[PDB]
Amino acid sequence: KSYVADSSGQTYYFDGNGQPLIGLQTIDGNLQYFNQQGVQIKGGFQDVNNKRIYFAPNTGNAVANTEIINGKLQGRDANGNQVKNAFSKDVAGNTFYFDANGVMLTGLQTISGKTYYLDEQGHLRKNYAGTFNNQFMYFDADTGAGKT
Amino acid sequence: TGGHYENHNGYFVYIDASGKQVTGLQNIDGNLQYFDDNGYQVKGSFRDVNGKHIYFDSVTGKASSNVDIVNGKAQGYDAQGNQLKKSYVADSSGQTYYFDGNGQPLIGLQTIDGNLQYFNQQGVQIKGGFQDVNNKRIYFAPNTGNAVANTEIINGKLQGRDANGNQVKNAFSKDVAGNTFYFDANGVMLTGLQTISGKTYYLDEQGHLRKNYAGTFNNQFMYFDADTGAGKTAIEYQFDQGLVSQSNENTPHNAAKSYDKSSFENVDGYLTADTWYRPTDILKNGDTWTASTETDMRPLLMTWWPDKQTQANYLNFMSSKGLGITTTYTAATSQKTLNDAAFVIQTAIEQQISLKKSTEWLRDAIDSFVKTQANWNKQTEDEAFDGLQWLQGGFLAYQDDSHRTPNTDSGNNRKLGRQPINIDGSKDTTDGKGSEFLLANDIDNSNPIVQAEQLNWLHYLMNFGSITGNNDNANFDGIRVDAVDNVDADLLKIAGDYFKALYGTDKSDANANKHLSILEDWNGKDPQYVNQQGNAQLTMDYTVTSQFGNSLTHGANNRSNMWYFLDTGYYLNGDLNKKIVDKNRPNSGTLVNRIANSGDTKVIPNYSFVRAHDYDAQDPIRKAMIDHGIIKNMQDTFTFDQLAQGMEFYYKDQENPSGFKKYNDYNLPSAYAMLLTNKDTVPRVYYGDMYLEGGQYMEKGTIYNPVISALLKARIKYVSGGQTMATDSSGKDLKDGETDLLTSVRFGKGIMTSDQTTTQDNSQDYKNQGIGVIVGNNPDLKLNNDKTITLHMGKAHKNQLYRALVLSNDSGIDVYDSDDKAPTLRTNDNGDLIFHKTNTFVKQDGTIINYEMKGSLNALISGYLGVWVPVGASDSQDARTVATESSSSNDGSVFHSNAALDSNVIYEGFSNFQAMPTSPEQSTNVVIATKANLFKELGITSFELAPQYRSSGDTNYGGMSFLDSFLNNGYAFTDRYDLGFNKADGNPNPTKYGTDQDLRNAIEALHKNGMQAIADWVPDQIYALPGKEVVTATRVDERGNQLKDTDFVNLLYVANTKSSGVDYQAKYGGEFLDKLREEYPSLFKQNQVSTGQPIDASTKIKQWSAKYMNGTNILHRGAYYVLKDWATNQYFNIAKTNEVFLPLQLQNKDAQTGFISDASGVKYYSISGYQAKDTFIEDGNGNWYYFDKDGYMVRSQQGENPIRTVETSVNTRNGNYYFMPNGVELRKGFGTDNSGNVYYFDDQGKMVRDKYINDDANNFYHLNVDGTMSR
Amino acid sequence: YLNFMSSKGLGITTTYTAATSQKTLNDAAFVIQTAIEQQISLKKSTEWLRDAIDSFVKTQANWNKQTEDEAFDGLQWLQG
Ligand SMILES: OC[C@H]1O[C@H](OC[C@H]2O[C@H](OC[C@H]3O[C@H](O)[C@H](O)[C@@H](O)[C@@H]3O)[C@H](O)[C@@H](O)[C@@H]2O)[C@H](O)[C@@H](O)[C@@H]1O
Ligand SMILES: [Ca+2]
Question: Do chains C and B have 3 or more beta-carbon pairs under 8 angstroms?
Answer without folding.
Answer: yes
